[PDB]
Design a protein around this ligand. Structure first.
Ligand SMILES: *[C@@H]1O[C@H](CO)[C@@H](O[C@@H]2O[C@H](CO)[C@@H](O[C@@H]3O[C@H](CO[C@H]4O[C@H](CO)[C@@H](O)[C@H](O)[C@@H]4O)[C@@H](O)[C@H](O[C@H]4O[C@H](CO)[C@@H](O)[C@H](O)[C@@H]4O)[C@@H]3O)[C@H](O)[C@H]2NC(C)=O)[C@H](O)[C@H]1NC(C)=O
Ligand SMILES: *[C@@H]1O[C@H](CO[C@@H]2O[C@@H](C)[C@@H](O)[C@@H](O)[C@@H]2O)[C@@H](O[C@@H]2O[C@H](CO)[C@@H](O)[C@H](O)[C@H]2NC(C)=O)[C@H](O)[C@H]1NC(C)=O
Ligand SMILES: *[C@@H]1O[C@H](CO[C@@H]2O[C@@H](C)[C@@H](O)[C@@H](O)[C@@H]2O)[C@@H](O[C@@H]2O[C@H](CO)[C@@H](O)[C@H](O)[C@H]2NC(C)=O)[C@H](O)[C@H]1NC(C)=O
Ligand SMILES: *[C@@H]1O[C@H](CO)[C@@H](O[C@@H]2O[C@H](CO)[C@@H](O)[C@H](O)[C@H]2NC(C)=O)[C@H](O)[C@H]1NC(C)=O
Ligand SMILES: *[C@@H]1O[C@H](CO)[C@@H](O)[C@H](O)[C@H]1NC(C)=O
Ligand SMILES: [Zn+2]
Ligand SMILES: [Zn+2]
Length: 426
């Protein structure tokens, strides 16, 4: 007779879960026609290679492909308390074939698709570099796109998040279903090389100052943070000595993340359209923070490229009330198979702990895995390289130079450590 909260049984709490989707790249022009140069504007006049209802490797996503991905999530039987959605909704077409209004229409379509299918799910979006017109020119002051997405994302975001989004394309937001957890959604397109609007700016849109203040507040309020953004930190794994964002910004952002590694329980990016790991470490090689780059829904590639990805979506598992990452489940669509029979079969690609025999996703666990990758003829690395393209090509091989670039990028996010790795291993 005393109104005490009812104690849960002595069972183990279920893990928490969230989805990560990215790089949808809807092409509304997609249609099958005999002249394969007219299947999709995103192929820019190339003949689509072998187009079907779920897309083509030379095209961005048909609406049916995106719908199949979200329908899979909806019908998966997995519980999830939120979703993160890291940008890039319009297709790869020349700048004159788009407009601000068209970009907003595509982002609206994707947002409303998600809201329609998941009415009870809090979603945390980030802007991508194609989420603006012209592409990549994301500004340092308010804009029609920033205002539009603040309006579109109001169902998921509080007043303060809406205000920062409208001004600079970034926000932080407490996760309603997960007390103690905050999402920081950065606009890393401000740091992306093609952005003329931020040339020579030390702190475009004051995002670094804002990020430092936000992380310091989380530190003192005993929160944990998941960082989400479109373009990742670190180095491109397929090129030599090329930071994904401008070096000055990569160095500066990584310094903030090292300083706040104790608060940051995960970092989640897109843009690359590949499945990559990174481990942020200190200058002496001690692991600090795990970084997860998710592959795209779109399977697009250019004609010059040999490989591409299969469509992917992924799920993370975390410790409730603590937010340590426990696992990652990557799902995919075998696009060739789905197009041949005309039916999608979104399916499990791998569970990270099972694929790699690691205990969890903590920095020390993943650092040890990457040390295994570095061993000669590592079977773990062979598996990783197959998963990098979401199992698009089981015969893809990574020669010595290719492997050095991959492992160096996985392990070394800043210039000094990356270049030292090249020195040792080229
Ligand atoms: C996603 O779904 C696709 C579609 O099903 C799968 O791709 C098929 O994979 C099968 C099995 O690997 C392929 O069949 C094999 O092809 C080998 C030849 O490789 C390439 O060369 C031909 C040109 O001659 C290409 O046209 C072809 O598409 C391949 O890209 C052959 O060596 C195999 O022959 C032998 O295989 C076994 C013995 O191992 C026996 O059963 C056979 O009798 C024969 O002895 C075999 O034919 C098939 O070609 C692929 N199709 C396409 C369209 O690519 C993917 O594997 C799947 N992805 C995942 C991750 O599962
Ligand atoms: C796009 O493809 C068309 C068609 O290519 C032909 O059909 C395919 C199914 C395949 O079998 C190809 O090897 C064929 O060539 C191209 O148009 C044809 O191009 C060839 C060579 O220039 C020519 O002999 C034909 O007369 C052309 N027209 C047709 C109707 O066949 C076209 O060049 C391709 N465009 C691009 C940008 O690649
Ligand atoms: C990071 O924050 C600490 C703590 O400041 C507090 O943070 C919140 C809880 C909020 O309630 C603020 O009003 C608090 O002040 C900052 O520490 C302060 O530093 C000044 C020196 O400049 C010192 O005089 C105060 O006593 C400190 N406060 C406490 C509680 O120790 C710190 O400056 C912030 N760091 C950065 C880089 O911004
Ligand atoms: C998002 O866009 C797709 C098309 O690009 C829409 O689906 C099409 O809707 C029109 C009517 O508006 C139909 O004529 C098409 O046949 C539909 N299907 C396809 C595959 O094109 C979809 O309605 C839009 N969704 C939202 C929420 O706006
Ligand atoms: C769907 O994909 C996977 C293959 O990895 C498998 O679980 C299932 O059997 C596939 N579909 C059918 C019809 O078998
Ligand atoms: Zn993209
Ligand atoms: Zn991008």
């Amino acid at each position: 007779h005393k109104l005490v909260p009812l104690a849960p049984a002595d069972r183990a709490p279920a893990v928490g879960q969230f989805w990560h989707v990215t790089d949808l790249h809807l092409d509304p022009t997609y249609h099958i026609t005999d002249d394969r140069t007219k299947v999709c504007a995103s192929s820019k006049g190339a003949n689509a290679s072998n187009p079907g209802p779920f897309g083509d490797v030379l095209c961005d996503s048909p609406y049916q492909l995106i719908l199949s991905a979200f329908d899979f999530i909806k019908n998966s039987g997995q519980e999830a308390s939120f979703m993160i959605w890291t940008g890039d909704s319009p297709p790869h077409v020349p700048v004159p074939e788009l407009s601000t209004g068209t970009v907003i229409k595509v982002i609206t379509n994707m947002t409303m698709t998600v809201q329609n299918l998941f009415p009870n799910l809090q979603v945390f979006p980030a802007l991508g570099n194609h989420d603006y017109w012209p592409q990549d020119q994301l500004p340092i002051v308010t804009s029609k796109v920033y205002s539009a997405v603040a309006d579109l994302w109001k169902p998921w975001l509080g007043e303060e998040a809406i205000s920062t989004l409208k001004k600079g394309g970034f926000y932080s937001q407490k996760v309603a279903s997960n007390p103690g957890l905050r999402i920081i959604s950065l606009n890393t397109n401000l740091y992306y090389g093609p952005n003329i609007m931020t040339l020579n700016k030390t702190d475009p849109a004051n995002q670094f100052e804002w990020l430092e203040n936000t992380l310091n507040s989380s530190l003192w309020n005993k929160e944990k943070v998941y960082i989400i953004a479109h373009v990742p930190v670190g180095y491109l794994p397929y090129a030599t000595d090329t930071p994904a964002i401008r070096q000055y910004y990569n160095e500066k952002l990584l310094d903030i993340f090292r300083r706040y590694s104790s608060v940051i329980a995960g970092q989640f990016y897109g843009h690359t359209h590949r499945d990559s790991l990174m481990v942020l470490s200190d200058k002496n090689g001690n692991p600090l923070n795990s970084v997860f780059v998710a592959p795209a829904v779109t399977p697009v590639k250019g004609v010059l490229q040999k490989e591409t990805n299969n469509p992917g979506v992924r799920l993370f598992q975390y410790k409730p009330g603590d937010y340590t990452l426990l696992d990652m489940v990557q799902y995919y669509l075998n696009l060739t198979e789905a197009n041949l029979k005309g039916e999608s079969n979104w399916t499990l690609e791998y569970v990270l702990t099972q694929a790699y025999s690691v205990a969890d996703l903590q920095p020390k666990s993943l650092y040890a895995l990457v040390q295994q990758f570095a061993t000669k003829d590592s079977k773990q690395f062979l598996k990783y390289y197959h998963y990098y393209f979401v199992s698009y090509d089981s015969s893809a091989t990574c020669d010595q130079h290719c492997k050095t670039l991959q492992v160096c990028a996985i392990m070394n996010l800043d210039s000094m450590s990356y270049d030292d790795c090249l020195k040792q291993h080229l």
